[PDB]
Amino acid sequence: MNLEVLCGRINVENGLSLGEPGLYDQIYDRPGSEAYKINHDFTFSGLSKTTDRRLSEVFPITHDGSDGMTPDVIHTRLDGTIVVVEFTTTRSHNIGGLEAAYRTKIEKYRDPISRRVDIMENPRVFFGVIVVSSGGVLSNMPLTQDEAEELMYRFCIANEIYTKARSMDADIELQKSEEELEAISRALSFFSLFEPNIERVEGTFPNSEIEMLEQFLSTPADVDFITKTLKAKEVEAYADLCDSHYLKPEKTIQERLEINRCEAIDKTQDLLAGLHARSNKQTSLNRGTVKLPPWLPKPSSESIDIKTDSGFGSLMDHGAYGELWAKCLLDVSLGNVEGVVSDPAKELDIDTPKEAKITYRRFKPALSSSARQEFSLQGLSPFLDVEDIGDFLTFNNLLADSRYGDESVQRAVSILLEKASAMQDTELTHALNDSFKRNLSSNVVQWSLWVSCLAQELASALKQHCRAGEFIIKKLKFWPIYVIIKPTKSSSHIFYSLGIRKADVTRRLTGRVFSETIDAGEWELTEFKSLKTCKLTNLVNLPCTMLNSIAFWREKLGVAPWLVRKPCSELREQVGLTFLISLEDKSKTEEIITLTRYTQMEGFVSPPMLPKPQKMLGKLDGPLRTKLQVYLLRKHLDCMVRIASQPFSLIPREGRVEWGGTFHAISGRSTNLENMVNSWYIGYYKNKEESTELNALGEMYKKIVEMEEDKPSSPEFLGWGDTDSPKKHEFSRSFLRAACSSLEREIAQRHGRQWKQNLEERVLREIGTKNILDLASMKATSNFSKDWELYSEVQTKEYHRSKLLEKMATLIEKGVMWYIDAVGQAWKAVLDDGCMRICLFKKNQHGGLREIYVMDANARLVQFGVETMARCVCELSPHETVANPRLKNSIIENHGLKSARSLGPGSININSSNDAKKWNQGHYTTKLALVLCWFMPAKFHRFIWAAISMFRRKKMMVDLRFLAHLSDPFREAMTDAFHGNREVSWMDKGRTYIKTETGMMQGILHFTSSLLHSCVQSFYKSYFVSKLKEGYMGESISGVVDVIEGSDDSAIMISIRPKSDMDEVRSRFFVANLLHSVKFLNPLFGIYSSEKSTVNTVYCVEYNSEFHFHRHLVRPTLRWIAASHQISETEALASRQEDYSNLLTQCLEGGASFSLTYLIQCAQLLHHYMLLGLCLHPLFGTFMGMLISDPDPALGFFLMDNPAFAGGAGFRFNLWRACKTTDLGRKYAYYFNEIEYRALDATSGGTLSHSVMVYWGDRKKYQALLNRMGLPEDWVEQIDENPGVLYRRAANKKELLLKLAEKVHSPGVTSSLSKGHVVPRVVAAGVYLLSRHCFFSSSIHGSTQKASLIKLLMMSSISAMKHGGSLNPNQERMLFPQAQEYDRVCTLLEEVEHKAEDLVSEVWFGLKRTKLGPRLLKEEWDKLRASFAWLSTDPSETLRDGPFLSHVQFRNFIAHVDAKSRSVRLLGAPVKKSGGVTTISSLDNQERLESISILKHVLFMVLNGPYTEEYKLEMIIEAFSTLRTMTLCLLSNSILDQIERAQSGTLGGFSKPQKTFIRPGGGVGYKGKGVWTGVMEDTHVQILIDGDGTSNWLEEIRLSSDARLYDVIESIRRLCDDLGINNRVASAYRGHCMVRLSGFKIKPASRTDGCPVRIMERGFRIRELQNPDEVKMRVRGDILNLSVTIQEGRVMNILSYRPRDTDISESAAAYLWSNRDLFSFGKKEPSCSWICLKTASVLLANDRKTQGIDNRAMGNIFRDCLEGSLRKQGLMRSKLTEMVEKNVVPLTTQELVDILEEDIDFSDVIAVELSEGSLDIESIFDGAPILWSVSYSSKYYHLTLMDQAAKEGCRGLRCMAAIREQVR
């Protein structure tokens, strides 16, 4: 297709441009003498070709140091731009395997073209590269979708042709194999050696033998068994369908839809009866569900002391509970306190903090024998009357503003908010903040703040070992409340009782749902409630999880954050429910709201089928303990009685069809579709802290073993022969083979016919060759051994898990290396030691990834070797949506178009949702071994077989406290199993290890099950196609099938066109069966479909959590919002903001508008300032006053983003917005522009800090007991003696030890082995560093940052932090009017791609790294030396200088300095930006402009140019200069002089002229030393010039402001070119300059190399009265000049103009077509037909002008347009071998078929005669719905005569030579 159009697509501003490389892939259905080059010139043929013979050496860009080597295409457009492109092909199927080609191509051409573009005049040069592969195409030749595939059709064909003529494949690639040889050889050596232990391996493990592999790979599938099994299963599926739904008797939907309603009522009543009987029948219970008193007191002044003249009473009324408070008040009144002084680093490992951080916790004594007797004892039916919970959910004081808006509790944060928002000071922000304070006084965060205070306080009291005589008492602060704590012997629970004076309680939040309260003598005591520790990390972040419900839900209702309405009735219910659920943290309370999803998705069920929600019942049995759960269950048990009677309805409006009346699950309200789907995620949160405790840990032991005893005795069904029937734990062999033999075909038809010979040489190249130790991981592991099994042996020891540096070091000392001499021991170490050894972890959230297994760091090695061996096989398969990361958003969204290319307009859609019941405990390790050793080519067998022969007797280690507590029918079983019989044989008599053979593990053996599921889905597709091809007695229905599936998740999409009346109904039925049969035919494999699937949705697809409704995408937003509070235990105090911003930037992709991801930031503010300190450590005042003056993110200072575009770009963007303009602008400069230690420089993450908050952490255990292998105490000095070991990999053991020692001690590698309730462990880690810096000084050491600093330090800044940073200085204040519109949007993406430290490695070093040319490669230092003044070529002096101490410390400062904000993807309103916001719920010039953009290039003599525009400006009269068009309006042929005195032109007089000298060659000679001044874009620069020999040069530059100098340099790059000054010679440094310049470059200062640009704010502010009468207009090589002569023979261009190529209009041609008045457009030439662009007869009339030369005005070379004969000779094709020997692609793409890879044909027949046809009642086949989710004609008539008159050269070799002249 064109070269022309492709070249015409791109654009550029100046000099040289590379653009941005893009990556296209396969989306549509991919169709389809002697030489060795066919692979290249078969593709890119016909066009990639320039029909000009050479064009040639790079000549057109002038002169030669190079040669100018020969490119492929060198195009030149009609606007002067030059385009050079090169094409090359690669055979590597891996993405990123093209990066190599894209890097080695630009290397060839970057040097000479950069050299030539610097030695010519204004230049437009474009360099681009094109690379193609069998899998994709990477280019920034910015192509479209259709031809991207066309480039691969020919590529595959060319490779097929190429492979055959190939010989000794002698090409070896010299650029590769430098290290890849030394790598690959090692893996070859190893795998060629002896890894198996095969004689005793068959005995150590039950079923692992080399008799299944050989009898599996060499036996073809039995087609008879298959053709009988399918025929037996289809009839069963059909009979089951006709009876689970009622179809046999003649009925209609009406009386059909009721029978299932009646039976669902029956089933629900049955369940209710079964529950009621098995409980203590008790009608009116009485208790509280919220276990905290409903006190809301007006806060007061902050203090931490138990106030005094209160205490006394009446306390003495009871003598039980008031007596206790009286006794403690009287104890604390006088003396009786004690010195228990929690310190902040007794708490942790550490120095010597000061007095103000040690606080009191005041013992108490105890009470007499009245109440000890009572303190010692304290120290369900489904028919309950629970409607009190409803009364609470329908009436609340919750969302009702209190009167506490201005109190001391928010005044602390209402000032940090001011300081943060002090940057984006707009009217919008001042309205988006007073709408967040309105949510900080809403009567619920007020009640939650003191609850969070209490929870924080109680978290610290999990220790301190209070005496036998015991009590504690604190007044949490900001409000008078008093607690009494009593720790326990343990860490599991805490006792407390709240007391409060009866006068400060102003308001109670209401209802009868809160716990009762003792009514004492004017006090409220709360009688010793108890709270566990697993329920503590929640109550802490309670305010931050209510503000995200008062804001989110308030937004999903059509409310505006800048309005104040009454709380709607539909709002109170949604808030009072997420309030209740968040406090009853019991697991089975949320397991009921979650299952409102799988029971409501079933309402989308299509025709013939029925919504069956009552199948979700066998999971709701429960014990039914608590009270709220009762209401939840009895409400949820009506959403499956309301749906089963009336499904959701379809309504096609010609619009992309929406659905009927949906409704809320719990409270039934017919709220909208996108609104209900979030209600399924009300109770959801995430967490990572280990939750070792009795109850929950029990269920996770049952889950692992529940399918253990199921394993069959006989192994004849596991690996062996067919079964025809599964036994709940085994599968058939022949089906596995016939399924894994389909993916191997679907791979080879896209990628290969050769591919193993690349997959191997890739894996091999990667597996053991680039895995160099000393970089394995910090992944915590386990140390479990045989000496730990007997419970009687060590009943009292502990368990630390040895984060995984021990196996690292103990090997590193042993002369180890590549991880390839390491499988070396550790396999023997496992074989002769028994089996795998595994411990467990419970990350409690409620559910999800809730249990992870550690690996023991000794089977981890042999597992990492098989991880990649399968991750690389997954990367090739096309359905894999877990190896291939992003394509999951490119198969559902592309089914779409892909349906329509195939068949007209359309659709119909039929979609499933699949899943698996038990994906972990259902598989058996023979399947994965067979799949792997089936794909891995030749020698991967003896290794993978052994490495998979390890999960056969696997031993798991249960908690120690568990067994201690041992000495529900399941714990009773485990007890008997441990002490004495019935025997389980799972743990044998009396030991500690769950031992099991059945089932893979959760996360360990990953990327291997995905292969299995891929083969299964491929077989399913290849069978569905084959059945669609035979629908009814030979009649073939047509349709496409798409299968997308990750691990334990699947989906199946189908579409079919209806061309009639039964035929839709006659066809839809035939689909249902075919799609419903996947309940069967999976048990033949090891896959069991659960009851969480939904079959036959008609227009939606439910895959992972994103749902695809017909044309509108919807994603749970509430899933990620409540995931924005996770607690941070890092210790880089500045990494907390990094993590907060990272977690925030996901709510954007979650569909949250911009007005919400700023309130989320406002909440994260609280969540962040609550952890440093806000409720304890009464020095926050000082800690606030410090940051209120300093503020920087390096200390605890939070940075809020821009309200519009909130959370769009990451933290780095905010660091750029704030450091640049008015945040600091000094703390960073001082680090960069002073020599000889503000603060020792150290970088954390992306930012950089004072290296004081990067200190706390226990490095001791790794180096006091692990410095036992050399590593002398001279370690830092000995490294500093040579710093070369920091950048190269390794040479010996010693330097490897040094590298390990440097790795252990910097960031973030902590080893002490925390047991603590992490919540105080973060407040400590905050306040410690925040205090040890307060005791100022360093703060007494002028600023901005220069433009050259931002570029090196923040690289993306001009790329995309200026576009967005200038479009937000857009309406920042406006207020749009609310409209209504529904529309599909685009897919937008900002910073996608496919460094600044490698520069150092080489001046110092050698080592062949960053491949620059010695122009740029030897010019990068200059730019790198200019910046970070004190930096030099010395490896040592880098040191004797600033802000490092040491070279070792700086590997981290050059390491991340930099840094490069992430990726964000987001929607829109269509295509163009500030067109993405959006969201947040005059032609006369054009005709004239065209008549100039075409005019400058016409055949014309230069003087005839101004003959036409001068006269042209008499009729096109554009308006005022009140808004490049500005210059155009500047052409009135007022006064003009002052019109340039404004608006970004350039002018300036010559203040100090030089001396003129008459040189004897017709030219005057300027010789004196003069000065030029000017005013360009508001700088008022001075230009000092001098020269005494051959020419003049540039002495000095001055300028008044540094805001813009990258543009000013351009205005001076040409201003010397005008007047003729050279910039090569050096100067003598005069003052303190910013930087200096070489011919046109930027530099250091410290070198005194060239002309220094010494900025002086006051340098020169004068101008000198230029005379306006000397003003001309000029023309040249196409350029406009409204210039002025300043000196005799020296002119100065004021304005210029270069016409773009995107302005060649066609509407102006009509206007210009003959209003014959334009005399310049007469009868003299194709003028008036070139301009008015259409081809008396001028063809023959030009063959005369080229031989007889008499063209009074067309006096050019005579060949400027006549070379364009190829434009029309291009649309006529010239490719010989591409059309005649190219049998038209005959559409060989049949998708798949069952008769291929099954050697024999198939016959699959069922019975469909007389059931019924009239069941469906609707019509959509006739329905509307749609599309499920230049200017080259110059000379065209007079060319076809050449086609009439008639490789071309050969032909020539007469009557047409006159035309051949025009082409040559």
Q: 642-701: which residues touch Mg ion (CB under 5 A)?
A: none
Q: Residue 831 in 3-state DSSP?
A: helix
List the beta strands (DSSP E) in 252-322: 296-297
Contact segment (CB under 5 A) with Mg ion among 727-735, 846-854, 1041-1049, 1498-1506 equals 1041-1049
Minimum CB separation of residue 681 from Mg ion in Å reads 15
CB of 1438 to Mg ion, least distance (A): 56
CA–CA–CA angle 1020, 1023, 1025 (5° rounding): 110
Question: How open is the CA angle 1271-1274-1275, to the nearest 5 degrees?
Answer: 50
CB of 1050 to Mg ion, least distance (A): 7
DSSP secondary structure letter of residue 566 = P
- Of 1050 and 1311, CB closest to Mg ion: 1050
* CA–CA dist 715, 693 (Å, integer): 39
Report the C-alpha dihedral over residues 133, 139, 145, 151, rounded to 10 degrees: -40
CB of 14 to Mg ion, least distance (A): 52
Binding span for Mg ion by CB under 5 A among 1049-1057, 1295-1303, 1557-1565, 1853-1861: 1049-1057
Q: Check whether 72 is labelled as a binding-site residue.
A: yes
Closest CA to 1423 of 1597, 1621, 1584, 1640: 1640
Which helix H or strand E contains 1040, and what residues bound it?
A: strand 1039-1043
**Residue 671 and residue 674: Cα distance in Å, rounded?**
9
457 in contact with Mg ion (CB under 5 A):
no
The interface mask with Mg ion, positions 260-299, x = CB under 5 A, is ----------------------------------------
Q: Which is nearer to Mg ion, 766 or 1045 (CB)?
A: 1045
**Calpha distance 195→193 (Å, rounded):** 6
1678 is in an annotated binding site: no
Contact yes or no for 486/1205 (Cβ under 8 A) = no
Whose Cβ is closer to Mg ion: residue 1108's or residue 1125's? 1108
Contact 42, 154 (CB under 8 A): yes
H/E run at residue 676: helix 673-679
Closest approach of Cβ 915 to Mg ion, in Å? 5
**Minimal distance, residue 913 CB to Mg ion, in Å:** 5
Neighbours of 1409 (CB within 10 A): 14
Q: Which is it for strands 650-651 and 658-659: parallel, antiparallel or unpaired?
A: antiparallel
Minimum Å gap between C-beta 873 and Mg ion is 24
> Of 884-923, which residues contact Mg ion (CB under 5 A)?
915
Residue with tokens 């479009």, as numbered in its chain: 1367
Task: For residue 1049, state whether it binds Mg ion (rule: CB under 5 A).
Answer: yes
Cβ atoms of residues 1285 and 1279 within 8 Å: yes
Give me the least distance between CB of 953 and Mg ion, in Å please.
34
Which CB sits closer to Mg ion, 504 or 915?
Answer: 915
CA pair distance 93, 522, nearest whole angstrom: 79
Q: By CB under 5 A, is residue 1045 in contact with Mg ion?
A: no
> 733-748 and 223-244 are packed helices; what angle lies between their axes, rounded to 10 degrees?
100
157-165, 279-287, 1042-1050, 1471-1479 -> range binding Mg ion (CB under 5 A): 1042-1050
Q: How far apart are CA 1705 and CA 1488, in angstroms?
A: 10
> Six-digit token pair at 726?
């599964």
When the beta carbons of 601 and 1318 are compared against Mg ion, the nearer one is 601
C-alpha span between 1823 and 37 (Å, rounded): 53
Residue 423 or residue 1101: which is nearer to Mg ion going by CB?
Answer: 1101
Residue whose C-beta lies closest to Mg ion: 1049
Active-site residue identified among 105, 327, 364, 1423 = 105
Alpha-helical regions (H) of 1008-1049: 1009-1028
Q: How many residues bind Mg ion (CB under 5 A)?
A: 2
Query: Using an 8 Å Cβ cutoff, are 1239 and 1444 in contact?
Result: no
Q: Distance between CA 114 and CA 103 in Å, rounded?
A: 16
Three-state secondary structure of 1657-1712: CCCCCCCCCCCCCCCEEEEECCEEEEEEEEECCEEEEEEEECCCCCCCCCHHHHHH
Sheet holding 910-911, edge to edge: 910-911, 1052-1056, 1039-1043
Tally the C-alpha atoms within 13 A of residue 29's C-alpha that lie toward its C-beta. 21
C-beta closer to Mg ion: residue 693 or 1049: 1049
Tell me, rounded to whole angstroms, the distance of Cα 617 from its chain centroid.
38
Please choose, from the candidates 1615, 1567, 1616, the residue with its C-alpha nearest in 3D space to the C-alpha of residue 1591. Answer: 1567
Pick between residue 268 and residue 911 the one whose CB is nearest to Mg ion: 911
The CA R_g of the chain, rounded to the nearest whole Å, is 40
Nearer to Mg ion, 39 or 881 (CB): 881
Rank residues 915 and 1419 by Cβ distance to Mg ion and give the closer one: 915
Instruction: Clarify whether 728 is annotated catalytic.
Output: no
**CB of 1060 vs Mg ion, minimal distance in Å:** 34
Nearer residue to Mg ion within complex by CB, 57 or 915 = 915
Smallest separation (angstroms) from Mg ion to the CB of 909: 17
Q: Which residues contact 1063 (CB under 8 A, 6 or more apart)?
A: none
Q: Which is nearer to Mg ion, 1045 or 1595 (CB)?
A: 1045
Residue window 992-1031: x/- pattern of binding to Mg ion, with contact defined by CB under 5 A: ----------------------------------------
CA 469, chain centre distance (Å): 56
* Smallest distance, Mg ion to C-beta of residue 881, A: 12
Confirm or deny that 276 is annotated as ligand binding. Answer: no
Tell me whether residue 335 is exposed, middle or buried, using C-beta atoms within 10 angstroms of its C-beta: 0 to 12, 13 to 18, 19 or more. exposed
Residue 914 Cβ, how far from Mg ion at the closest point, in Å?
Answer: 7
Q: Is 326 helix (H, G, I), strand (E, B) or coil?
A: helix
Binding site for Mg ion (CB under 5 A): 915, 1049
Q: Annotated binding site for Mg(2+): which residue ranges?
A: 1049
Q: Annotated binding site: which residue ranges?
A: 40, 72, 86, 1049
Residues marked active site are found at 105
Q: Annotated binding site for Mn(2+): which residue ranges?
A: 40, 72, 86
